[PDB]
């Protein structure tokens, strides 16, 4: 395994983007994850569409909520997903529109990442961005600005991320994660939580829930 790994710097992940005030994260997790195979892959960086998710998960409940599987799951039924300006973000529920259906990018299937194992994690960041959840009701979290996190936070799962890579500096090694709070949260949108800690959870519980798309 890599001693370090950063997906932005592969071209492998595009800028950050805004959920705005609709609880949609799990779809933006999902996107990332799917625009960073489809470019690891085809070597093509495409912009994919959150708002197709939201408004055609029927398992999930849009903004108020949903898992990224389930996302992973309608982009494989439908056989692909629609870019991200033919299907613009609206940031609120809607119709899932048929008309419009257009999948520029498809996935084979997805996968879960072995549970409580920062190790197994590593090994699956390092083929590819991968999707996660983590605690960020805390303070501590959505205050953060810059540096490594190694605030308070517990392991809910209650948002979804995409971790983009990882690295070490002051030998603390971190997770380089990809927010979708827009550019002004954190470190331009990113956050590097502390990597390697003494819980098997991870970091604000990353390790619990992460799973990625497949694609051949
Ligand atoms: C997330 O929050 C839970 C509470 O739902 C924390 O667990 C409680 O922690 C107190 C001490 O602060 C302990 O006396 C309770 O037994 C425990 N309750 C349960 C149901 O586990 C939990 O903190 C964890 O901290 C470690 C050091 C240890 O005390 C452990 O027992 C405890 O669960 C928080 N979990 C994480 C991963 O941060
Ligand atoms: C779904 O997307 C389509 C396309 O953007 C929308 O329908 C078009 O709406 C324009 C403007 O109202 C009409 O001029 C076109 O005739 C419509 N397309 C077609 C093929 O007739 C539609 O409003 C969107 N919403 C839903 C629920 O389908």
């Not at 799990?26 to 994919?48: H, K, P, R, Y």
């Not at 197709?52 to 398992?59: F, K, M, N, R």
């Not at 629609?82 to 529109?97: A, F, H, L, V």
């Not at 800690?197 to 990625?212: L, M, Q, V």
Request: aromatic letters at 10%; glycine letters at 10%.
């Amino acid at each position: 395994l890599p001693d370090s790994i950063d997906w932005r710097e592969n071209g492998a992940v595009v800028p950050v983007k805004n959920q705005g005030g609709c609880g949609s994260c799990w779809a933006f997790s999902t996107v990332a994850a799917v625009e960073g195979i489809n470019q690891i892959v085809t070597g093509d960086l495409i912009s994919l569409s959150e708002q197709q998710l939201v408004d055609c998960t029927t398992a999930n409940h849009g903004c108020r909520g949903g898992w990224m599987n389930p996302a992973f799951q309608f982009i494989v039924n439908n056989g692909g997903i629609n870019s991200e300006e033919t299907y613009p973000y609206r940031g609120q529920d809607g119709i899932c529109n048929s008309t419009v259906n257009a999948p520029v990018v498809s996935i084979d299937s997805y996968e879960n990442v072995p549970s409580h194992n920062e190790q197994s994690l590593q090994k699956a960041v390092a083929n590819q961005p991968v999707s996660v959840t983590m605690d960020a009701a805390g303070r501590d979290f959505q205050l953060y600005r810059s540096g490594i996190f190694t605030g308070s936070c517990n392991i809910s799962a209650n948002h979804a991320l995409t971790v983009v890579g990882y690295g070490t500096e002051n030998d603390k090694d971190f997770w380089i994660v990809k927010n979708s709070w827009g550019k002004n949260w954190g470190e331009s949108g990113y956050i590097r939580a502390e990597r390697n800690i003494e819980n098997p959870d991870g970091k604000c519980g990353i390790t619990r829930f992460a799973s990625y798309p497949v694609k051949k």
